[model samples]
Target: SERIPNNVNLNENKTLQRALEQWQPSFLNWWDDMGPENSSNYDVYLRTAVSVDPKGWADFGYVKMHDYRWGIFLAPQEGEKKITFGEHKGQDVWQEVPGEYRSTLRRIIVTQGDTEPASVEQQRHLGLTAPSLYDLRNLFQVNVEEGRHLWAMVYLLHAHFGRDGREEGEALLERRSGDEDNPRILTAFNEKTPDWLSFFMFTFITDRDGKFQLASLAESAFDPLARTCKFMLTEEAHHLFVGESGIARVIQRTCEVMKELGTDDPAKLRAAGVIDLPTLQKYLNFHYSVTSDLYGAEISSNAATYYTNGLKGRFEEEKIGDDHKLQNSEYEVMDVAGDKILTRHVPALSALNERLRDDWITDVQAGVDRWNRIPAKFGFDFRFTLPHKGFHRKIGMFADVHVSPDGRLISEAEWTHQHKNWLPTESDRLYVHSLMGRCLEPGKFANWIAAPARGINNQPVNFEYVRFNWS
Candidate 1:
């Protein structure tokens, strides 16, 4: 019932309270209209944050989407928290943006804030094609939490940013996910999430990217922004679970079908009502590369500025045993060298984007291995591989390059001729979408995806996780 729970003493801050109260309704209106279309009435078994405590902080219950408890939650504060990195290293963290760094801080916050609602808009229609009531519930759960995350960012903007922040908050709601005229701030968010497969791919790959970005922000010199991200990271894990596990389940189901029908052929697998392993690999290539682009250019002046200004830090900056300020360190970066790939040494400060991308690749490879193992356990020889960073990219270093998944640099003519094999062809998407009929019966899944081994909250697999009650 409580939407804004603050330990920062908001009750006494009349100006901040009035500012947020003005914006809260517009957020609710956005949620009602654009959040999860036609899903407000489902009694979803979702988790809401009760506190920032790592242990015993969330309460699980069945609540209607329109009635879900959305809140502004920040991770518990630590007194005497020191700015851990950047030019401000060893200085006390700021409770407010330092007057000199206001513009830089606002830009970082606005860019990060823009992504929260963009995802919700991209996924608004997924409830219609949900594989099970269980999944429908999970989808709505993700939507509402993303909505809450928007509130978390908006709280900072409205309270700290004044009139300029309020205008940015309005703009966050104004943008659409895939609008050609008014697209989202990031490219990947504007891509269509047409089917559950793509949704899983997004959550696993894109949301995992969020984890790294938020982890970096959680180390912010502005204490409120840092603490807010710290708690958001907790909820962020479940999103990646939904993504990684959802894709793995699809693989599991396909493998099961391949064995039952006794064939490894693509046409045969499709005829038998399952996605082929190679096609799955193509989707993997497309989504992984698109999401990777969200990291921005590998060698970025903006990234260097953010780091040197103490606005954002690398993932787990505290654990890295280096000078927190990367003054003289050099990082190896990939660059194109006359139709060949080459690694060049760049300043660690400018290479922050690549460093973050490298960490993400490690996590993605581990997940891909886990997916391949599902096929392996079933005695199938198929595997999944992340394409080279330069493959099928529309942003960052490879935006203009033409490279295959195997890291073979190609000319435009060659790329046009062989594009279908490396990315999801038109036929590939149609076949996947064709298999996406609703299968909302409890404990049952559409033929294309396997049932998860366990249910949410220790409920039986057959438990009705979402009860449709559309008004």
Candidate 2:
């Protein structure tokens, strides 16, 4: 069939392919009802996958997303790949789930699968308020790629995990992002992506979490899961680009205004419709803390199981030198002892979540550092900073404790009195929302955000990124 494209020989495996073929219709309907609103008829400057090669993957042109190809692709298998970590270290990698590990593996895939569609559902309405066709088109590109990612997860289920996997695959489409009774698996995915700043922040903060998680899975001993995540990471990098650049442009615009008008006042910035620096930090702190929760507890028995049993590995597992088996290792994590957040070492196996979170946060800090450059160049004294990792956390040792942005342990009473200043108030959201109505004119961006440094695929600034139906 010419419908879905990939190297999987989907047409040849009539039975397994039929399983996905049956699931395909529901996925399309999900996209229609839950994808970008009312834009299927629009031809977007979309990129569709041609193959797994990095060189071949950038096949770009205008296509209606209703027909955008979503398929099963695994990185070309390395011959005789071995499970490189845990008790299974040096063992041949698995093509199908191992008996003892099947349910655990299935749960991991199911959780990863749920986030993909959950994100699409959360951002479904965003395209309607896109600040530019360029932004709108970028939004859809991320949307469909997320959809493709869900398909990738579903393919793993149907191809490998048998009946139970099929059931979980169907359930992925049923749960809504924020549905009260049937919310997504991860708390952060269930939250809203209400405005572009929020969108950029999610892409910047949350998707980096996805990247870290994906890279960890990319090292999986289960070969297909690793392969699937490896390819998903490629699409994910462009997503990071959208997020990092999107936030940078917003910062640049605000700094431009602040420099020209000779003010650092929030009222002046808000009146001018450009976001002030503190507001950006508020959004950053909120998203960063919530995304931080996605790593689960800093020390978890389940994370150890995922690692020591060879179901997952630490981010870029191959790059780290040591016994991949952490049986004798120790890792540092923080704990609240005597009202002090102090560092302590746990068995490294039990602290993989913290290790991964720390790895992601380092990269996140670097991204924020890049964001800091735009404002710093304009001579602003305000530099965006990551709130203390424990600050505003809802999971791990600090979940019940109160900490300030500066890493000070504080009273709950103080947090209650001060959090609105540290996080986005409803008033802040309303202001961001007020600036978010459509600005989809070709090449023109919203006043609140600056245009990109360059166009998608090196097209000119005025490229007709999204063609409005003229009929």
Candidate 3:
């Protein structure tokens, strides 16, 4: 029972409890083989969430990566919740999946569950080249949290879906992030996070997408899924923090170099061993575009179906003032008309992806604005921006089109000629990789990144975040 901790009273349910316990060794094997590379010997400073109580949600301490407690946790349920959206509005929430929507609900859980482990696998190698002990510890913490999230989803599968769910749970561990035969479900998860910059961009941009999706699912009419995601969102906040602050520190270090050397030149900044603003902007463009695809097509019937069935709702569904069923309502969505980009009114139900995507764009911009302020605070004239929603898109309205970061329609030749400037080039990656050398000395950080403004849990910056017990 110590192998899996929970507040759902796993001890009372022998079959479900035994199912997960049997799966535990395989999960550990995957962690040992694909979790953090060469980190098993280190005792890392990590926050383990053991309960859902406000007073004791988590406790931080040093624990070996192999021994971290990855558990199933759900936010404490409030009394007698009702289905908040779709045709089921005003009805008591279902503790079990509705018989009519079983397949759809299963797909939804499997897709969401698949992403958690894919991310851990993508980031497995990052600890080997961590920029600082602080960063190394944060990476491990995020990895463990992601693993727990996978457990969260797996718990749903085993408890609710029966035999098929158990098989899907096993399959979750089998698929590799970028494997040719068994890649992750979402395209962005399949892409590489080879360097720390890409890793930070992912946690900032892509993981933020996870935040939005989880928020939407947290509104589910299936009460258990809703509760599971609600708690998952609590831990997800730190991932975005790690990303936003990681990029901020990178910018801070670059600005310091730019001010000292008195240049904003990318070539010169690269020579000084810090990621320049332009490259940071390029990284932003790539990550933002890839993550945007996760929202799926702007005009998806699946989105409409999910909403109508009360399976998945919009971000903060209760806050929006409407009939909840989305009947006779219209939402504005952007589309391409010949040579021009324009907004058109569509049925609000059918435009669910667009509406959610629009909300995400607003949220992403808030963070971008915060990143831009870092340069402004440094007295630099440079600024960072999210590429136009239609820019570099691989899905939705812009999949077949080429658009500039400024939102202009461009020809393929033009895109090819200018893309290197707009996105990270091979040489840019090489330079960033060159800077990936590990810097584990407690207070010391890689030259390309500034030290965190403060340390975790009020400890000093130099605290040994990861104690290496190399044999």
Global lDDT of each candidate: 0.86, 0.90, 0.91
**On a 0 to 100 scale, what is the lDDT of residue 262 in model 3?**
88
Clashes of each: 0, 0, 0
- Using all chains and alpha carbons, the TM-scores for the candidates as numbered come to 0.97, 0.98, 0.98
Give the clashing pairs for model 3.
none
Q: Summarize candidate 1's per-residue lDDT along 1-471 as a digit string, tens digits.
A: 444665566778888888888887888888888888876666788888766766688788888877776777787788899999999899999988888888888888888888889888989888888898878888887888888888888888987887899998899888888887888888788888889899999899999999999999999999999999998898899999999999888888888888888888889989988888899888899889888888888888889988888899999999999998888999999999887999999999999999999999999999998888898899877789888888888777788888898999998999989988878888888989999899877789888888888998889888988877642
| Model 1 spans with C-alpha error above 4 angstroms | 1-3
Which candidate achieves the best lDDT against the true structure?
3
Q: Cα miss at 90, model 3 (Å)?
A: 0.4
Report the CA-based lDDT of candidate 3 relative to the real structure: 0.91
Better of 1 and 2 by lDDT: 2
Sequence-dependent TM-score of model 1? 0.97
lDDT agreement of model 2 with the native:
0.90
RMSD of each: 1.5, 1.1, 1.1
Please provide the root mean square deviation of candidate 3 (C-alpha atoms, Å). 1.1
* Candidate 2 TM-score over all chains jointly: 0.98
For 1-471, candidate 2 gives per-residue lDDT tens digits of: 377677778789888878888899999888899998888799999888878876666589998998888877889989999998999998899988889999898999999999999889999889878899889988999999999999999999999999988898889988998898988888898898988999999999999999999999999999999999999999999899999999999999999999889998999999999989899999999999999999989989999988988999999898898899989999999888996878999999999999999999999999999998887788777889999999888888888888999999999799999999999999999999999979867789889999898988889877999997882
